[PDB]
Design a protein around this ligand. Sequence first.
Ligand SMILES: O=c1ccn([C@@H]2O[C@H](COP(=O)(O)OP(=O)(O)OP(=O)(O)O)[C@@H](O)[C@H]2O)c(=O)[nH]1
Lengths: 161, 65, 78, 78, 78, 78, 78, 78, 78, 78, 78, 78, 279
Amino acid sequence: HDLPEGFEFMEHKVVNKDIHAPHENLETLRLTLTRQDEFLLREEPVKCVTVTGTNGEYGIYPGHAYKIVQLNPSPLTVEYTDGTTKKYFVSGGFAHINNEGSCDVNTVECTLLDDLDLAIAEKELAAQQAALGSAKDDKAKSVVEIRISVIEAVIAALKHH
Amino acid sequence: SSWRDHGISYLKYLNVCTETLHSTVKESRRAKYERWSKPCYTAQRPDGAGGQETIDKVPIHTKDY
Amino acid sequence: STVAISVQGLHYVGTGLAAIALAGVGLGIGTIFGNLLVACARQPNLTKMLFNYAILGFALTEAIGLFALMLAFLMLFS
Amino acid sequence: STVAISVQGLHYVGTGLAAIALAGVGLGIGTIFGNLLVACARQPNLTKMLFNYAILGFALTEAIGLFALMLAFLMLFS
Amino acid sequence: STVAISVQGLHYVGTGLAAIALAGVGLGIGTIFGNLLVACARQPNLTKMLFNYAILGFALTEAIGLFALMLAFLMLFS
Amino acid sequence: STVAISVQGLHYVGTGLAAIALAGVGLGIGTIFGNLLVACARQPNLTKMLFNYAILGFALTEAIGLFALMLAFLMLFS
Amino acid sequence: STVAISVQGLHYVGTGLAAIALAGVGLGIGTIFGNLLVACARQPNLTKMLFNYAILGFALTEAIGLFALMLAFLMLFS
Amino acid sequence: STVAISVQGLHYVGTGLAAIALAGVGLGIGTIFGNLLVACARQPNLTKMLFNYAILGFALTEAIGLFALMLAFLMLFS
Amino acid sequence: STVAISVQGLHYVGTGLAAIALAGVGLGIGTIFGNLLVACARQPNLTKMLFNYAILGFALTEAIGLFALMLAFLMLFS
Amino acid sequence: STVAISVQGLHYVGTGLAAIALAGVGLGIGTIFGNLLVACARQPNLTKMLFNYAILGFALTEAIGLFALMLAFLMLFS
Amino acid sequence: STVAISVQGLHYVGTGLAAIALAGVGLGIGTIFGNLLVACARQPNLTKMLFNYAILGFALTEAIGLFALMLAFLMLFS
Amino acid sequence: STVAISVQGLHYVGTGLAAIALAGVGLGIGTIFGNLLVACARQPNLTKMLFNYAILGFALTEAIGLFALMLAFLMLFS
Amino acid sequence: SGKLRLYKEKLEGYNRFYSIVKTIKMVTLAKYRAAQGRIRTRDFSLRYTELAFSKPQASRDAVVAAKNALVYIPITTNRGSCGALNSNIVRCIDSVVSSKMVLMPVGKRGIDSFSKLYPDEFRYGIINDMKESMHFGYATFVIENAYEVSKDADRYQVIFNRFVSAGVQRNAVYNIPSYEKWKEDLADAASSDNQKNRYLFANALQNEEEQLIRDFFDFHAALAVLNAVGENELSEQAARLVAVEGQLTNISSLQQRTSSLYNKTRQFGITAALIEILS
Ligand SMILES: O=c1ccn([C@@H]2O[C@H](COP(=O)(O)OP(=O)(O)OP(=O)(O)O)[C@@H](O)[C@H]2O)c(=O)[nH]1
């Protein structure tokens, strides 16, 4: 009796480059954008990806050093080698960058910036501001601040372009 | 930012962020997106009488955080 | 005994030393315009505010630079 | 035997030295505005309080600079 | 022979040297505030304890600066 | 006695001292570009912007050096 | 010839040089507190402990300055 | 009296002081390349561009050095 | 012709120059303790171990100063 | 009157000053290799390009040091 | 005319200038141990190897300091 | 008039100045080893290459140190 | 009289039962069609989760070695008629019985099955109404309740059903060790040459702060739980379809049997009455 492990059924493993190996010049980055155990892009070759981390923005191009990034509610830009830009907006998650030429961006929610609307964000922001004064306690204040920050980020992303 | 000092965990922060993001979605698409944030989960224990005693270990809604 | 001397050439030496005060001043400016870049990459949306603060810092350092330059020029034409 | 000598030009030399300290002041200012920007990029919501604290630091450093500059000027006119 | 000489202006030189001791003092203060800003950006809720520690550091550095300035003023009046 | 003395070879020494200011200038420039690289490696798409700001920094620190150079010439030809 | 010359004012010069030591000490102290802030904003639960260590460092670093200062006094009162 | 004096050897001392400028220049250059490495490791795909900018920085710092050398060669041969 | 001069007051200059070395020692100690404070906030469980190493560095950094200090006495009392 | 004095020993002091430039050279080189190691830790597969660029930087900084040595030897044998 | 002047008190200045070289050795040791502390927290499982490497670096810096002290003692006695 | 002097003790002064170069050498070495430890913390399996590169950098800096030492010995033993 | 009436009545009952089961089949087929889209979009979210938690380990040392609570989070369906999934999960749990075992099951069936069999190793269960899509919030709720059940827990074992194909639903396990053990293993991988495949990953994690590491741990645990619940839902739908088809076949066979008996009874009664009346 030996139960399997759910990772054995997934054959698309992660390719980690060895320390003492020759370098390779890459022209494309394999992106893997995921939302709630669902991918929008499957190892798509792209020229670059811009992700807004906690410390600041990161512009990931092929060959970037191995790194882990804790994302914040913010836009995410994907620019293909053709010259076409695709912009999403994320609410949170992580971004794993591999020196072998891969970037796995696993987000709780990643939705097209077009799907978002402006007036809705403005009214929700006003409601949250009104509720902040009537916050039951400190925790409610922090939660309302979180929501307000998310809405402000959405509005800034929309107004930028 | 200030939510960590109050004991709020990271997962609750993610849930709040996703709920706000869904609330910011257009009218048409929200019908789909709202299905990924509506709480429909509860904790229960069977008592002697058969009643499903509900637990309060973790809040279900975001306003209860 | 009672003796007194007036070495004129010394007025050059001091003028040189005051100039060394600029060594830090210039360096300071660099530091600003270093971090500014690192600040503009992380938050490109705030280039204007960061640039204004950098200009403020440059002016504040230039004040000290002009103080030292004033000392040097006074000790040069005196 | 006794020989008392009053060299007039030496008061220049010291003056210049008193100005060198200004470098350690000016550079310091940049350091403040070297990091302030970064902070404003890390936490843009605190663009105001950080500015006030940096101004306080600059004021203290400028007080030190003026303390040195007083020695610089006293020996230039005496 | 047994010659002996006293020079008047030398106290301007040494005094100036002591003023250079304020170069590393002021700079030091700036460094503190620099870091302070970053800290206040990293942990914005600690805007008062960090301010207190920065004030303590400034006080100690200023004590060192005053120790140097005492010599600077004392030689200038000897 | 009242010995006015004119040492013609001192104007070299001061000149050299002024040149030391360039040490704090060139170094500063390097710092800028140093950070510039780290800023380009993070957000390369912003290079065309950052570069300009970097140039601006070099246009300021360099302007400081000229002042020192000016002295180093005025004392070297007077 | 063979002259036993005794200059008096030199004791000022050396004294001033000793004060330059403080330029490091002061700066060093600042560095400590700098890191202290970056350490209190990175793990505030240890603040008190950290503070203690910081003080210890000061009580060591400051001591070095005293050494230098002592020398100054020895030369300034002799 | 009016005692003009031409001390030849002084034209060496100033030259040496000018060479101290190369202390900064050199260091600055190193700093640039330092960051260059940290950048080329972060995003190797941009090495080329980074390299160019690094060269630019060098081409500026060395320029300052030239002035210093000029001063030296304008005082050693004078 | 052959002239022998024995200046008595020059040991002050050498003593002060030797004392200048303590700036580096103070700065090194400050850097050690700043890095210690940063490290302990990252790995608190091992704080004690770190402390020991820090002290070791101090033991290996103060000693150098003693040598400099030693020279001072060897010239100040001679 | 004008009094031409040809001192011999002054060709040594200037030499000793030029060597100080090397202090800003060696440190710079250190810096480079420092960063190199970090780079090889972050992107170890890119060791060769980093090594070549570091060698280039060392060559340039050593060229600056060689200019300083040229000046030092010219003055030492003059 | 020709004057063969032998000043008996100039070796103190050289000894002090040589002793100044320890300000770099001390700061280098401080940097070594600060980085050691930072690294041990990062990867405590390799404490012994890091300690050995830091000891090696300290030994090299101490060798440099020993050369400086050799020069200082030689000038002080000879 | 036509006049010429030769001071014996000046060759000490220059020697000391040359030793100051080592301040920028030893420190550099520390820098290298500093970074080395950090690298060895985040790439334990790449320790051999890092150690070899650190030794290379140390030797390259020691080359500058030996140049300065040779100048000092030439000015001390001749 | 009585036999024929009873046979016809039970035949009508079987007919109604068959119609109800057919409606259930159609509804479940619609749900399966809606949920089948996951197959295209799966097997890519959990890539670095493998590095975080995938470890080939023995089934004995990991069990006996621990002396703290071993939390178990079996995934079970709310409604029955799924098949043998719940039975197999219960068997797997039974094979792993220990004094340290603690259960926080999921679904009504799991609660009702583990409450009676394991009363002293059962604390409480989670229930989700299958109204919305299985989202991250549900996984976070499960993880938070698991932590509150036993915070000083050696591991958190999630047992679910993996839907390999329409007719293959295996049992899969996700093991989520405690933060301390995970940190120890990560440090060993980063330093030692062993675990060469996770060396870069561990070193990257170490370079970052500790709050980030904890957030990473929680996030990937939630992702694993989400994958488990989604696969369990899909497997439940498939098995429900299969069992419904089997029940339909059995019902049809029983209806045929009853029709044959009804024919035999009517013929027998008619002939017997005719013979005993007109003969
Ligand atoms: O006091 C400290 C030190 C370090 N750190 C954190 O440790 C990490 C060290 O990260 P690195 O130093 O390895 O990378 P980096 O320069 O690219 O950093 P980022 O711009 O990506 O942030 C960074 O994420 C930094 O924020 C702190 O948060 N506080």
